[PDB]
């Protein structure tokens, strides 16, 4: 149930659009430079520059019988504990976010509710200014200034991500917690739980049968309690992750696909736009 819920979470956050828009050949719309949040054909990878930095910020299974024959992952696998791959490859999630950014840069807000409608980017930005309380002319007599400030803020975001820091800390917290729980299961397997030893082989090698079921049942109940505790903690963590994923889904529907009037829902200030980027086990909104 938990393993199905994870894929449901990812699909309900990222698969919002019903059409996969092409990345435009030009990445310069009215003075606004979009090249740092869109894929490029010259770079061998398929994701963006900021997505490259995000995927390199968070640190993180190809073991076989010939591969390992004191690794912790092989010790997990020899005791019956396995990790399953996600259904969506990171390249598909990058494709989804590229489609979202292209639709925002080309069609505006209209593709969220109905079919997409083309509009020049400066008129879309004037419409965004109009929905805040500022008049339409304030964009048009100050267009180059606003474009330059947008480009400078994008460059500042890129520099602050490419420097070393403790951002993206909660995704790292999630992966650390999962690894710690699996290691706790592996290390809890050396308790005797009230028996003479924690090995089955030596308590079968030297005991009569009737006493041997007594010791075996003590070990069995101990290990069964260990597995039950692990499953309960996993269910609680899954509920927390599901609440976070629901908040991410409504944030993408109300802030990438439209303009929000809710205070501090999307940034600090008066909301103009939002752009999604993919992160390991997560999303990043600009």
């Amino acid at each position: 149930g938990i393993a199905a819920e994870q894929d449901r979470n990812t699909r309900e956050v990222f698969a919002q659009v019903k059409q996969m828009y092409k990345t435009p050949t030009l990445k310069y719309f009215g003075g606004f430079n979009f090249s740092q949040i869109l894929p490029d054909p010259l770079k061998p990878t398929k994701r963006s520059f900021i997505e490259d930095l995000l995927f390199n910020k968070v640190t993180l299974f190809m073991k076989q019988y010939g591969e390992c024959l004191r690794d912790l992952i092989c010790a997990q696998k020899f005791n019956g504990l396995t990790v399953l791959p996600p259904l969506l490859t990171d390249d598909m999630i990058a494709a989804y976010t590229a489609a979202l950014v292209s639709g925002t840069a080309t069609a505006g807000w209209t593709f969220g509710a109905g079919a997409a409608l083309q509009i020049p980017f400066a008129m879309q930005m004037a419409y965004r200014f109009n929905g805040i309380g500022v008049t339409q002319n304030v964009l048009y007599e100050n267009q180059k200034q606003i474009a330059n400030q947008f480009n400078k803020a994008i460059s500042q975001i890129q520099e602050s991500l490419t420097t070393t820091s403790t951002a993206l800390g909660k995704l790292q917290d999630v992966v650390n917690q999962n690894a710690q729980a699996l290691n706790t299961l592996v290390k809890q397997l050396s308790s005797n739980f009230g028996a003479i030893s924690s090995v089955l082989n030596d308590i079968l090698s030297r005991l009569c049968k009737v006493e041997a079921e007594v010791q075996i049942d003590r070990l069995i109940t101990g290990r069964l309690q260990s597995l039950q505790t692990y499953v309960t903690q996993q269910l609680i963590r899954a509920a927390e992750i599901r609440a976070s994923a629901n908040l991410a889904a409504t944030k993408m529907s109300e802030c990438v696909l439209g303009q929000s009037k809710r205070v501090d829902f999307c940034g600090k200030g008066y909301h103009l736009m939002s752009f999604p980027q993919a992160a390991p086990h997560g999303v990043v909104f600009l």
């Binding site: 696998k77 399953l84 490859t89 020049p120 924690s198 090698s205």
Partner: protein, 673 residues
């Protein structure tokens, strides 16, 4: 002369009435679609822990069996026969003829043990024979087939008819014929089965969990009809290959006559300790000479002393009287257990005692043995005190012949004409350690050569198990023999013959998933292996030991290497669909068309292109009104439990024992409310 047992050979396992239930059990069963041997119109067919015997005839040619070991005068044998209008079961010493015929089958019978006569009396007659705990179980069933030239397919349940208390070493058998027919023989194996009962209590359908991945899945979820999807399954496959026994090479018989047939033992206060080393503990050689009145072992079963090797063997010897032998035990009080000889609370070893009235007792009176009855404290475990200082009730020293000054030692007076509580007894206490240290006193077990890189059963100085033996690069200290993992699992061992280090690993590794449509749709499955290449599944799963229907699912043409594993049993296509069964890593599977299971890359969505321009706009000119539904859950069912009915039911004894756990149900009631 080789055929298949197409889902036959199932019998009632108990005497308990069950209706409309699934009952999963494990016993000696004939495997589904396994090899049977046909005999058509008789040698000594070997017996191996039960057989399935089927007879197809039209003139009643098969008329019984002979069971035994040697088919000779020199062992007990049982005949089960069907002379005309009787059924005779007889267990005796038989001079069995080479050709038994006309239901004549023996020459002379003597030393008869068992005998039974029943009351006076196109077909398929089926029997199951199994030997267990001195009982021969015979199960019978019958089907009215019309015509056949082989064993016909079908399903039938056999009922118990005989449970004979023979106590016979049965290792061979031979059928008995008159002088066209056919009889088929199959062998039973220890297997797990699942059985379905009707509303009348009849076993009508069964599942064996070792032939297909599908049936492994069916009894993995305890159901007979499975839905559509992918499921993780268990490991109901692998059997170990062989046996490896490694023991130190010691040729010396161990000094039993030096320890037990000694000329003299010491007193109980001056008991003596000896070290035993480099010997073979074959105590069977004492079975004509020395007989023990007390023999009691602590920490180890007495029936396994032949299968172990012992580390630090010491023997303590002394002589007591008959009443004091009960004090040689871990927790005891008395004069011997307090002032003479004490055993630890966690003692592991053996205590042996025997009567020695013909040696240590004289008609005049033997006064050479002593014991201490006065001390200022109690001895520690395995502590000795052989002083002879005179004793005083206060701590001051004193002169011997004065007042309140005593000699601390006392004499055993051993006469020939006393009761057995005042007769001398010789006691030997053996102390050792097990399975944690290098050892040099082993049992008489024989060794076997090493088998590497294969899942075998091993025995290294008494340490049994199952795993894969590979060479290691570790370095052991001279005082170390075993090595432990982070889960305290033994992974390293030094070979006691050729002193090298070996690494023991499990032979089960990786998961197996079963992709299936509905069981009503088809009976075809695909199998996904996560953590292997399928260049290299043959080494990983030990494919050689499996049934033929399992080797078609390990190599072939429909293999396909995905990123989640590789998939066997599905056809790969280059057309992308939106998917229903998610395999993983972008791969999905479905049941398309000659139906087959196909695997593809899932589709993200439709393709589009919007022409960006700096001076054109798109404006809608018309509209529609749409109504969309959305369904949301609000509540679930409110429930309540009663601990007393659930745990104890109607018993008042359990209800009184449940007053201790009184606070553990008010909490559950509070949560549910």
């Amino acid at each position: 002369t080789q055929h298949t047992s197409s889902m036959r050979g199932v019998y009632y396992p108990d005497e308990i009435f069950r209706s409309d239930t699934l009952y999963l059990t494990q016993d000696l069963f004939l495997p589904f679609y396994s090899n049977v041997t046909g005999f058509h119109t008789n040698p000594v067919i070997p017996f191996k822990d039960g057989i399935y015997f089927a007879a197809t005839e039209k003139s009643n040619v098969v008329r019984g069996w002979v069971f035994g070991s040697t088919m000779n005068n020199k062992s007990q044998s049982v005949i089960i026969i069907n002379n005309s209008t009787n059924v005779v079961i007889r267990a005796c010493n038989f001079e069995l003829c080479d050709n038994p015929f006309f239901a004549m089958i023996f020459d002379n019978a003597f030393n008869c043990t068992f005998e039974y006569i029943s009351d006076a009396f196109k077909h398929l007659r089926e029997f199951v024979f199994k030997n267990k705990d001195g009982f021969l179980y015979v199960y019978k069933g019958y089907q009215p087939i019309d015509v056949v030239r082989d064993l016909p397919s079908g399903f039938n349940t056999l009922k118990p008819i005989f449970k004979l208390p023979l106590g016979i070493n049965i290792t061979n058998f031979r059928a008995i014929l008159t002088a066209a027919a056919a009889y088929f023989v199959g062998y039973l194996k220890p297997t797990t089965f699942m059985l379905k009962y009707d509303e009348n209590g009849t076993i009508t359908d069964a599942v064996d969990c070792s032939q297909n991945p599908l049936a492994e899945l069916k009894c993995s979820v305890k159901s007979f009809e499975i839905d559509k999807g992918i499921y993780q399954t268990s490991n109901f496959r692998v059997v170990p290959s062989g046996d490896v026994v490694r023991f130190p090479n010691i040729t010396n018989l161990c000094p039993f006559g030096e320890v037990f047939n000694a000329t003299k033992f010491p007193s109980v206060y001056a008991w003596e300790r000896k070290k035993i080393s480099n010997c073979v503990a074959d105590y069977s050689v004492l079975y004509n000479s020395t007989f023990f009145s007390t023999f009691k072992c602590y920490g180890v079963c007495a029936t396994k002393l032949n299968d172990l090797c012992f580390s630090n063997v010491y023997a303590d010897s002394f002589v007591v009287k008959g009443d004091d032998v009960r004090q040689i035990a871990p927790g005891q009080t008395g004069v011997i257990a307090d002032y003479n000889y004490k055993l630890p609370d966690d003692f592991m070893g053996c205590v042996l005692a025997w009567n020695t009235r013909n040696i240590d007792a004289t008609s005049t009176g033997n006064y050479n043995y002593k014991y201490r009855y006065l001390r200022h404290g109690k001895l520690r475990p395995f502590e000795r005190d052989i002083s002879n200082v005179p004793f005083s009730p206060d701590g001051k020293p004193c002169t011997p012949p004065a007042l309140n000054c005593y000699w601390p030692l006392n004499d055993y007076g051993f006469y020939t004409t006393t009761g057995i509580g005042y007769q001398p007894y010789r006691v030997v206490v053996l102390s050792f350690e097990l399975l944690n240290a290098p050892a040099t006193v082993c049992g008489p077990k024989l060794s076997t050569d090493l088998i590497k890189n294969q899942c075998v059963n091993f025995n290294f100085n008494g340490l049994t198990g199952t795993g894969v033996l590979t060479p290691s690069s570790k370095r052991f200290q001279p005082f170390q023999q075993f090595g432990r993992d982070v889960s305290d699992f033994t992974d390293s061992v030094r070979d006691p013959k050729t002193s090298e280090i070996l690494d023991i690993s499990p032979c089960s590794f990786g998961g197996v998933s079963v992709i299936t449509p509905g069981t009503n749709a088809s009976s075809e499955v695909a199998v996904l292996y996560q953590d292997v290449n399928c260049t290299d599944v043959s080494t990983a799963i030990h494919a050689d030991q499996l049934t033929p229907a399992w080797r078609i699912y390990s190599t072939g043409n429909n293999v396909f290497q995905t990123q989640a594993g590789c998939l066997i049993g599905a056809e790969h296509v280059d057309t992308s669909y939106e998917c229903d069964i998610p395999i993983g890593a972008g791969i999905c599977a479905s049941y398309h068309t000659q139906k087959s299971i196909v695997a593809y890359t899932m589709s993200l969505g439709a393709d589009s292109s919007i022409a960006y321009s700096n001076n054109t706009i798109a404006i809608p000119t018309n509209f529609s009104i749409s109504i969309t539904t959305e369904v949301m859950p609000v509540s679930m069912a409110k429930t309540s439990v009663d601990c007393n009915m659930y745990i104890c039911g109607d018993s008042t004894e359990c209800a009184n024992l449940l007053l201790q756990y009184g606070s553990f149900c008010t909490q559950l009631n509070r949560a549910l409310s």
